[PDB]
Each structure stands twice: as structure tokens, then as C-alpha cells.
Amino acid sequence: DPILLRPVDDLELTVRSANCLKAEAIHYIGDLVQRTEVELLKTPNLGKKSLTEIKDVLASRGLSLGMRLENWPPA
């Protein structure tokens, strides 16, 4: 999709969550959605609420978590 290929700062993320993302080598939103929730919760600084509001904003702009890709990355 045209929205697979965006950096996450178009979502206007937060500093703690941003540190969580850059800390975990998660580059593309296609790389985001291929990651699973429990693969996030165990990670540093990602407990209750990061998952809450990131779930909110992805509920806003029409996508969800944990989805599955194929032919990734086209780069």
C-alpha cells in the first residue's frame, strides 16, 4: 500500500516510544506491522501504555499490528 512505506514520524510518535522503536531496529512501517505484540512487550520501556496509544493511532490511520507480509523488502 502507499501507507506501508512511510516512516513512523508521520504518525507523530512520542519520545519514549521513539526510543523503543530505534532501539529495536524497526525501520519501516512494513517492518512495524510484521512485528508482534509480545515481541514488543518484553522489550525495554514498552509496558502498558505504549501499546495502548500506538494501538490508538493505528486504529486512527487504518492499519493494525502483527500482520503478515510477502515480497518484503522491495526497498
Partner: protein
């Protein structure tokens, strides 16, 4: 074009925290005959200078954010 532009800008400014919007107004001479500075934001808000630079940055995230960008996007082709 200038008018509809500027009104849209102020309508984006309304949605922020107070210090954010007022700082980002007077820091650029917006809405006044003034032209106020990072240093002078130090003088008025509180002497902290470059956290205002980081605040400017954070606001640019808060506002650029392509859910608000698209009233501004027509003005990209300016």
C-alpha cells in the same frame, strides 16, 4: 491565498499547549510588530534557551504530522 493560508495556520496553532503556541508565535514575529529571540524567550518564559529549540522541534513533530500537513501541502508548490 495569503489570507486563507494564515487563518489555517492560526487554526493549527489553537490546538497546542499554551507555551508552545505563544512561544512559536512571538519567536517568529507572528501576530505582532515584534521579532523576539531564543535569548529573549529565555528572558520572558524562563532563561532556558535550547530546550526551546527542542520544544520547537517537538512542536514541528506535533504539527507537521500529515493529518494537519495537507492544508499546508498546497503551499508546498509555492
Amino acid at each position: 491565498t495569503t489570507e486563507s493560508l494564515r487563518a489555517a495556520t492560526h487554526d493549527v496553532l489553537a490546538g497546542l499547549t499554551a507555551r508552545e503556541a505563544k512561544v512559536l508565535r512571538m519567536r517568529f514575529g507572528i501576530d505582532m510588530n515584534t521579532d523576539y529571540t531564543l535569548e529573549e524567550v529565555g528572558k520572558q518564559f524562563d532563561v532556558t534557551r535550547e530546550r526551546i529549540r527542542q520544544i520547537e522541534a517537538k512542536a514541528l513533530r506535533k504539527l507537521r504530522h500529515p493529518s494537519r500537513s495537507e492544508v499546508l501541502r498546497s503551499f508546498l508548490d509555492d
